[PDB]
RNA sequence: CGCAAGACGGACCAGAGCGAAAGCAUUUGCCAAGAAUGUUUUCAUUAAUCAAGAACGAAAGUCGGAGGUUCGAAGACGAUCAGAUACCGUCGUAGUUCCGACCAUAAACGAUGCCGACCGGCGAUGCGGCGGCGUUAUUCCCAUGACCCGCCGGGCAGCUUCCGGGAAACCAAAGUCUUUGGGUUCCGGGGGGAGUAUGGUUGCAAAGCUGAAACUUAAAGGAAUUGACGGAAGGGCACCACC
């Protein structure tokens, strides 16, 4: 896992893809392109219960288990691409995104740029649920 | 009874009378 | 079939080069040229049954 | 049973010399084992770089698609594969009580790089203006849209793909449209919101190395 | 306003009344003495002309039709009639 | 994060679930410019000294 | 009886409008009918803008906001306390509260 | 990263527009249509409303052909429960999409026929017109746009009020009503039975249109008020509440 990079205080970047949905949270550090990946540990890989896969605690342990693998493999800095569930479903990130983004920031991983790559439809195919909605 | 289903039970019931008039015709 | 784009409607299609027209040659039938492979020189073609 | 990161080479990613800042980032790729070559699996990575990290100290909301077009050795040679806006900017511009205008142009340069440019134009509320609405008549919108389309056939056909990007790093197309529509309906927030690469010609290595020098 | 002068309205009131709604129906249009600086005579052009006015002896076009009052070519002097 | 102390300047009211945490504007004993709002248990008055284990956390102002 | 002077909606001279699928439910609510919030918001709420700026690369890099337009149905606006049962006089007030 | 498909046309998008209603939102081209305004044009009562007769008419549904990405009646399963053959989850048939014929119904609602007149105000907006300092772009001036102050006509609305009305809620129309008459079409006569039976007629069918009676019953019902209650939203208070 050796790079030819100068290691005084120069930032090795690498874009990360945060699929922060409402039932789980992914923290997927890739290369600047994204075509080759590095490590992808989630809320459902740390906790072995389903009702706290999306929990802020689960995505903290995820992004800390990201950062250690990300430290060793020669990366210093992180570009961040936050994502919703997206499409016809919700466009607002879930309850694990802020806990996740902080968890690798408090580790010492440098934060480059942030943006939303929530796959928003220009115009939508018919969303799941009825005419009369999701009655509960 | 909803007035929408009262209607639906008259439509099934009329359907059954065309069914049983045809037994004689 | 090498010298036409994908989604091309054809008929009297040869299953092998030179056999002089075997596939998709009954009335109202068509085979769609699905995708090409310039290396190995081969093409997926959806037959009238619906099997590429 | 074994580490895939005992095989990963970290290569420089060169911007074309029409941009200022050189370094983009280092990208891991598996070395040659079997048929495939490390260059082959590295000759199609679209690098989406923000303008401010790519060009010295300018607007940071514009991004540029960059394809690794030919890999030499320890260096990845990029090329303008399209222009993108940050959605944080694009979504901040579409606000209520004004007219959003859009125009697309399917246009090809002297060197056969057929781009698809996407302009946007938001109608401006004047200084003394009390009226909340500030909308355009349908004909005024398609007098502006027809004006947008002629400009992006007048700056893309008329010169080559290296000389269009030095118009795209500034707002040379996003300022031209803003000024020339003040007389139809005076509009403020004009950019060219996206450029998508469609049709490249037959790849010659010399023209790529000429972008990197 | 209970006692109003419906008998004898003020002249400014019968500008704020529609041409049909005025106490005696009168149009807001006029005739005008339009000349061009080209030739030396005066022609009569209607205010709401709604057609092109070709100048005498096939000179040029003077009056361009618009939504209401048809425009005059820049320089063409107009003087409203007395009747 | 070493152990700092912060001096109470004024209590901003009682918050929590059962009305127990005095949400208090505290003044740092080191620098008299940076002052934060934090959650204090027990009976709390004006002028007394908390022991903050960090300068980092700050309570949600109602 | 006719509780509202409008029909709890914003068509007056249409006849028909496009239906919106709700965000909480997937109810088919008319667009003009539906309760709408254009939620502009920072990626972190209060407690995390401290630390994410400290370990940032750039010197004073302003973070991106999160521009999403929510469409609540009447049942999922009153359940999540977006709108609320006002007095028979104070319903008329079309004033967005500060 | 490319690709192929069939849907859909976010944000802009509004108590904004158009259309007879249903309905209608990506770019451009094309083809007819239409109101409003403008009009010192033209015909000169040609008009209003209409039994009978007809055109169009969301969705679903029917027939055939093509297509089937998503969604998804029926249906398979997993939950929930005493049970759920329900809500909730994953699948999925008809359908949802298009082409040509059918069907003619919706809380097809503004639950308010259409044409006309008259009777308050107020601030907006939409379309055309008219006029008025100045600001602004085409700069190299005019005229146009953008605003800015008004006016007229027409339209969708809004606020206001002892116009008046009404059982009231509310309504510048739902007003001009015992001081009872502008014109005209459809239409209702306590609740049920019943939009049923029957006969015709329409349709491939589902079903539409027309449509009673015997009998039954002393109320059903509208608007408002006070209370009680709520698995509505708040605001309190109490060691027979918590902390």
Swiss-Prot record, chain A:
Residues 116-136 are annotated as: Disordered. It is found in: Cytoplasm; Nucleus, Nucleolus. InterPro entries: Ribosomal_uS11 (IPR001971), Ribosomal_uS11_CS (IPR018102), Ribosomal_uS11_sf (IPR036967). GO terms for cellular component: cytoplasm; nucleolus; small ribosomal subunit. Residues 127-136 have a biased composition (Basic residues). Transmembrane segments: none annotated. The keyword Signal does not apply. Belongs to the universal ribosomal protein uS11 family. This is Small ribosomal subunit protein uS11. It comes from Oryctolagus cuniculus. The gene is RPS14.
From Swiss-Prot, chain B:
This is Small ribosomal subunit protein eS32. GO terms for cellular component: cytoplasm; ribonucleoprotein complex; ribosome. It comes from Oryctolagus cuniculus. InterPro entries: Ribosomal_eS32. It is found in: Cytoplasm. Coiled coil: none annotated. Its main location: cytoplasm. Component of the small ribosomal subunit. The keyword Ribosomal protein applies. GO terms for molecular function: structural constituent of ribosome. Belongs to the eukaryotic ribosomal protein eS32 family. Keywords: Cytoplasm, Ribonucleoprotein, Ribosomal protein.
Swiss-Prot record, chain E:
It comes from Oryctolagus cuniculus. The modification Phosphoserine is found at residue 10. A zinc finger (C4-type) spans 36-58. Gene3D superfamilies: Zn-binding ribosomal proteins. GO terms for cellular component: cytosolic ribosome; cytosolic small ribosomal subunit; nucleolus; postsynaptic density; small-subunit processome. Signal peptide: none annotated. This is Small ribosomal subunit protein eS27. One of its GO terms (molecular function) is structural constituent of ribosome.
From Swiss-Prot, chain G:
GO terms for biological process: translation. Zn(2+) binds at residues 22, 25, 73, 76. One of its GO terms (cellular component) is rough endoplasmic reticulum. The keyword Oxidoreductase does not apply. It is found in: Cytoplasm, Cytosol; Cytoplasm; Rough endoplasmic reticulum. Signal peptide: none annotated. GO terms for molecular function: mRNA binding; structural constituent of ribosome. Keywords: Cytoplasm, Endoplasmic reticulum, Phosphoprotein, Ribonucleoprotein, Ribosomal protein, Zinc. Component of the small ribosomal subunit. The ribosome is a large ribonucleoprotein complex responsible for the synthesis of proteins in the cell. Component of the 40S small ribosomal subunit. This is Small ribosomal subunit protein eS26. It comes from Oryctolagus cuniculus. The lineage of its organism: Eukaryota, Metazoa, Chordata, Craniata, Vertebrata. The gene is RPS26.
């Amino acid at each position: 896992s050796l790079g030819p990079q100068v290691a005084e205080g120069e930032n090795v970047f690498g874009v990360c893809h945060i699929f922060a949905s409402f039932n789980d949270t992914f923290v997927h550090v890739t290369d600047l392109s994204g075509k080759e990946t590095i490590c992808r540990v989630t809320g459902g890989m740390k906790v072995k219960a389903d009702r706290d896969e999306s929990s802020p605690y689960a995505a903290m342990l995820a992004a800390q288990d990201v950062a250690q693998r990300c430290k060793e493999l020669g990366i210093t800095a992180l570009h961040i691409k936050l994502r919703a569930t997206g499409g016809n479903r919700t466009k607002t990130p879930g309850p694990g995104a802020q806990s996740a983004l902080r968890a690798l920031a408090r580790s010492g991983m440098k934060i480059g740029r942030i943006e939303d790559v929530t796959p928003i439809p220009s115009d939508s195919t018919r969303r799941k649920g009825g005419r009369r909605g999701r009655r509960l | 009874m909803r007035a929408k289903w009262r209607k639906k039970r008259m439509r099934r019931l009329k359907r059954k009378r065309r069914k049983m008039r045809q037994r004689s015709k | 079939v090498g010298t036409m784009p994908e989604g091309t409607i054809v008929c009297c299609l040869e299953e092998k080069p030179g056999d002089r027209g075997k596939l998709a040659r009954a009335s109202g039938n068509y085979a769609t040229v699905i995708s090409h492979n310039p290396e190995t020189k081969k093409t997926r073609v959806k037959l009238p049954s619906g099997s590429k | 049973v074994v580490d895939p990161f005992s095989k990963k080479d970290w290569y420089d990613v060169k911007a074309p010399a029409m941009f200022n800042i050189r370094n983009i980032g280092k990208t891991l790729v598996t070395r040659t084992q079997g048929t495939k070559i490390a260059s082959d699996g590295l000759k199609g990575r679209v690098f989406e770089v923000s303008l401010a990290d790519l060009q010295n100290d300018e607007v940071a909301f514009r991004k540029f698609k960059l394809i690794t077009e030919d890999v030499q050795g320890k260096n990845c040679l990029t090329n303008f594969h399209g222009m993108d806006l940050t959605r944080d900017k694009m979504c901040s511009m579409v606000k209520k009580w004004q007219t959003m205008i859009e125009a697309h142009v399917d246009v090809k340069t002297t060197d056969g790089y057929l781009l698809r440019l996407f302009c946007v134009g938001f109608t401006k509320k004047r200084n003394n203006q009390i009226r909340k609405t500030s909308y355009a008549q349908h004909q005024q919108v398609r007098q502006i849209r027809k004006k947008m389309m002629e400009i992006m056939t007048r700056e893309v056909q008329t010169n080559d793909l290296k000389e269009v990007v030095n118009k795209l790093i500034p707002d040379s197309i996003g300022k031209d449209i803003e000024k020339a529509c003040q007389s139809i309906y005076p509009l403020h927030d004009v950019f060219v919101r996206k450029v998508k690469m469609l049709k490249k010609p037959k790849f010659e290595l010399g023209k790529l190395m000429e972008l990197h020098g | 306003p209970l006692a109003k002068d419906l008998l004898h309205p003020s002249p400014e009131e019968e500008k704020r009344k529609h041409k049909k709604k005025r106490l005696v129906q009168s149009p807001n249009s006029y005739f005008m003495d339009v000349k061009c600086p080209g030739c030396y005579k005066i022609t009569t052009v209607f205010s709401h002309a709604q057609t092109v006015v070709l100048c005498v002896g096939c000179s040029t076009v003077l009056c361009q039709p618009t939504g209401g009052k048809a425009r005059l070519t820049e320089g063409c002097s107009f003087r409203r009639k007395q009747h | 994060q070493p152990i700092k102390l912060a001096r109470v300047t004024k209590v901003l009211g009682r918050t929590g679930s059962q009305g127990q945490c005095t949400q208090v504007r505290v003044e740092f004993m080191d620098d008299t410019s940076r002052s934060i709002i934090r959650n204090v248990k027990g009976p709390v008055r004006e002028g007394d000294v908390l022991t903050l284990l960090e300068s980092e956390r700050e309570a949600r102002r109602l | 009886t006719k509780k509202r002077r409008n029909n709890g909606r914003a068509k007056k001279g249409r006849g028909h409008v496009q239906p919106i699928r709700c965000t909480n439910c997937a109810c088919c609510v008319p667009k003009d009918k539906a309760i709408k919030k254009f939620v502009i918001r920072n990626i972190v709420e209060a407690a995390a803008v401290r630390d994410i700026s400290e370990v940032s690369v750039f010197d004073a890099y302003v973070l991106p906001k999160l521009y999403v337009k929510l469409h609540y149905c009447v049942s999922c606006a009153i359940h999540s306390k977006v709108v609320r049962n006002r007095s028979r006089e104070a319903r008329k007030d079309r004033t967005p509260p500060p």
